[PDB]
Scaffold this active site. Structure first.
Site, PDB file in Angstrom:
ATOM      1  N   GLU A  35       6.142   2.214   4.705  1.00 53.67           N
ATOM      2  CA  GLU A  35       6.271   2.376   3.266  1.00 53.67           C
ATOM      3  C   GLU A  35       5.252   3.439   2.836  1.00 53.67           C
ATOM      4  O   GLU A  35       4.107   3.363   3.281  1.00 53.67           O
ATOM      5  CB  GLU A  35       5.945   1.033   2.643  1.00 53.67           C
ATOM      6  CG  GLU A  35       6.092   0.962   1.169  1.00 53.67           C
ATOM      7  CD  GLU A  35       5.974  -0.453   0.687  1.00 53.67           C
ATOM      8  OE1 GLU A  35       6.949  -0.903   0.071  1.00 53.67           O
ATOM      9  OE2 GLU A  35       4.905  -1.066   0.899  1.00 53.67           O
ATOM     10  N   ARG A 110      10.398  -2.211   4.169  1.00 53.79           N
ATOM     11  CA  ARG A 110      11.071  -2.378   2.872  1.00 53.79           C
ATOM     12  C   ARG A 110      12.205  -1.376   2.704  1.00 53.79           C
ATOM     13  O   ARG A 110      12.374  -0.440   3.501  1.00 53.79           O
ATOM     14  CB  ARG A 110      10.140  -2.321   1.649  1.00 53.79           C
ATOM     15  CG  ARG A 110       9.358  -3.528   1.490  1.00 53.79           C
ATOM     16  CD  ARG A 110       9.067  -3.914   0.038  1.00 53.79           C
ATOM     17  NE  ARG A 110       8.118  -5.006   0.006  1.00 53.79           N
ATOM     18  CZ  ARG A 110       6.835  -4.931  -0.170  1.00 53.79           C
ATOM     19  NH1 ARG A 110       6.220  -3.765  -0.327  1.00 53.79           N
ATOM     20  NH2 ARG A 110       6.122  -6.053  -0.204  1.00 53.79           N
TER      21      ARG A 110
HETATM   22  N1  LIG Z   1       8.889  -0.969  -5.197  1.00 50.32           N
HETATM   23  C1  LIG Z   1       7.604  -1.390  -4.931  1.00 50.32           C
HETATM   24  C2  LIG Z   1       7.079  -1.357  -3.730  1.00 50.32           C
HETATM   25  C3  LIG Z   1       5.839  -1.673  -3.521  1.00 50.32           C
HETATM   26  N2  LIG Z   1       5.074  -2.074  -4.493  1.00 50.32           N
HETATM   27  C4  LIG Z   1       3.635  -2.392  -4.294  1.00 50.32           C
HETATM   28  C5  LIG Z   1       3.268  -3.730  -3.691  1.00 50.32           C
HETATM   29  C6  LIG Z   1       1.956  -3.375  -2.947  1.00 50.32           C
HETATM   30  O1  LIG Z   1       0.840  -3.495  -3.843  1.00 50.32           O
HETATM   31  C7  LIG Z   1       2.108  -1.887  -2.516  1.00 50.32           C
HETATM   32  C8  LIG Z   1       2.470  -1.758  -1.067  1.00 50.32           C
HETATM   33  O2  LIG Z   1       3.591  -2.555  -0.719  1.00 50.32           O
HETATM   34  O3  LIG Z   1       3.093  -1.358  -3.406  1.00 50.32           O
HETATM   35  C9  LIG Z   1       5.608  -2.102  -5.710  1.00 50.32           C
HETATM   36  O4  LIG Z   1       4.999  -2.501  -6.754  1.00 50.32           O
HETATM   37  N3  LIG Z   1       6.899  -1.752  -5.957  1.00 50.32           N
END
Ligand SMILES: Nc1ccn([C@H]2C[C@H](O)[C@@H](CO)O2)c(=O)n1
Ligand SMILES: Nc1ncnc2c1ncn2[C@@H]1O[C@H](COP(=O)(O)OP(=O)(O)O)[C@@H](O)[C@H]1O
Ligand SMILES: Nc1ncnc2c1ncn2[C@@H]1O[C@H](COP(=O)(O)OP(=O)(O)O)[C@@H](O)[C@H]1O
Ligand SMILES: Nc1ccn([C@H]2C[C@H](O)[C@@H](CO)O2)c(=O)n1
Lengths: 242, 225
Positions: A35, A110
């Site tokens: 990610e 993800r």
């Molecule tokens: N669509 C997403 C993906 C990730 N996160 C956040 C959750 C964690 O704090 C960080 C890494 O996964 O990003 C988020 O708010 N929205």
């Protein structure tokens, strides 16, 4: 593509990066697309080919922090960037990796689906995006995945299930600064979205194939050494059914 | 195969008017209008939100505007004209004016912060590294009108959202258009643009008076592409 695409899904600090980056070493045909969290914490865009010879690439702002500090202002911006950065990374790995693999598997940390149906949706539901922002975001997401989705469609999902309490502890273990004020309540709302989507399977999306995509659910609440063997045996067995 | 020509100019210079006239010269000519109706009814009115609170809404607006444009321009390539003698598509503005005129002006006026501007440029670079190729322009038509003319035309047209626009905003947009399309000093990161030919047309006069000749001049410019 002939590359199988498997998303690893799960709450914040469940243990996805830890698990999958260890798992992938079992097979030379297995790679991960992480990610792009570092790109969120240090926002940068490409330098001009001449300017970069004499100018450094500066540290930018932290839009992850901006979202956590004022989500009603910054959620739309963060979610839009998160998803763009992810699609960019995922598509490039498809075009470029595992070309000479026998049984290639690319594991995504993800997906565009959790971006929308878990995280952005929860923000909308918590009044951190207004109707206009939520409409704009879903329009953009729809449009992109009608251009690109085919290449990014998943062969399977591995849901790493941890309690909200375990997640909160693991956020403290990891020590990402901008996450240290996250309350149990927020993790719990994310938890329930994950359960609806991947365990109960009642959450409906705009991508019909997803109702049928195979899902493997793994409990990751124990200390890492204690279940790793069984996790790996479940994963290999899962992959061979695809 | 389709020739792609953008019509560029300040707010209410007369682009939709011009392009709608131009289209009728040839069954093989079509237009991609700017998706303004969608902007004004998302329904929420994101054009209005930007004008009323530009520090809050300029990033949201600029990304939706550009997204909506790319979607419509792409769509029009895929349908209508693939089956014509000399197909031409006239774009009401471009992804380059979205970024290098409008968004850039908002950033310079502190209506986007550094983070917002960086995210916008990253988004724009990627969104065009994928598409862009299919949307590359063969030519640009610049409709030049003074800021004062454009302010008058904003009043004539009567869009509610625009009636508060001050002359000074129009002057800023005019300077950026002149820099890009007349002086050619505006630096973008799309190298091919430096060579796209530009036809500059003065549209400051009432269209009761010089307009049919401007049209011929396009018909003919198109034959050099
Ligand atoms: N669509 C997403 C993906 C990730 N996160 C956040 C959750 C964690 O704090 C960080 C890494 O996964 O990003 C988020 O708010 N929205
Ligand atoms: N099963 C586990 N047992 C003990 N620690 C774990 C376990 N899985 C992850 N961790 C730790 O929890 C924190 C978050 O793990 P991480 O893989 O970064 O989560 P994610 O990628 O899901 O956000 C890290 O500090 C990591 O060491
Ligand atoms: N040359 C012209 N002379 C008189 N009115 C014009 C002229 N060009 C445009 N108009 C009028 O000015 C207004 C703005 O024109 P329009 O085509 O909508 O501008 P744009 O598409 O550039 O924003 C409209 O009310 C239109 O009828
Ligand atoms: N990138 C863009 C494109 C258009 N517009 C505005 C100018 C007009 O008020 C309306 C119709 O062109 O949209 C804008 O602010 N930013």
């Amino acid at each position: 593509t002939r590359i199988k695409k498997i998303s690893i899904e799960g709450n914040i600090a469940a243990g996805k990066s830890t698990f999958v980056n260890i798992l992938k070493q079992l097979c030379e045909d297995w790679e991960v697309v992480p990610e792009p969290v570092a790109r969120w914490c240090n926002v940068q865009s490409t330098q001009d080919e001449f300017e970069e010879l004499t100018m450094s690439q500066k540290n930018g702002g932290n839009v992850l922090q901006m979202m956590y500090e004022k989500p009603e202002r910054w959620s739309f911006t963060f979610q839009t960037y998160a998803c763009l950065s992810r699609i960019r990374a995922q598509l490039a790995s498809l075009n470029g990796k595992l070309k000479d693999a026998e049984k290639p598997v690319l594991f995504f940390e993800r997906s565009v689906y959790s971006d929308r149906y878990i995280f952005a949706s929860n923000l909308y539901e918590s009044e951190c995006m207004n109707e206009t922002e939520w409409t704009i975001y879903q329009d953009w997401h729809d449009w992109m995945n009608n251009q690109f989705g085919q290449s990014l469609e998943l062969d399977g999902i591995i849901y790493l299930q941890a309690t909200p309490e375990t997640c909160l502890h693991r956020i403290y273990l990891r020590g990402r600064n901008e996450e240290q004020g996250i309350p149990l309540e927020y993790l719990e709302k994310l938890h329930y979205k994950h359960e609806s989507w991947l365990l109960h399977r009642t959450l409906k999306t705009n991508f019909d194939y997803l109702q049928e995509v195979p899902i493997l659910t793994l409990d990751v609440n124990e200390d890492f050494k204690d279940k790793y063997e069984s996790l790996v045996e479940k994963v290999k067995e899962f992959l061979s059914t695809l």
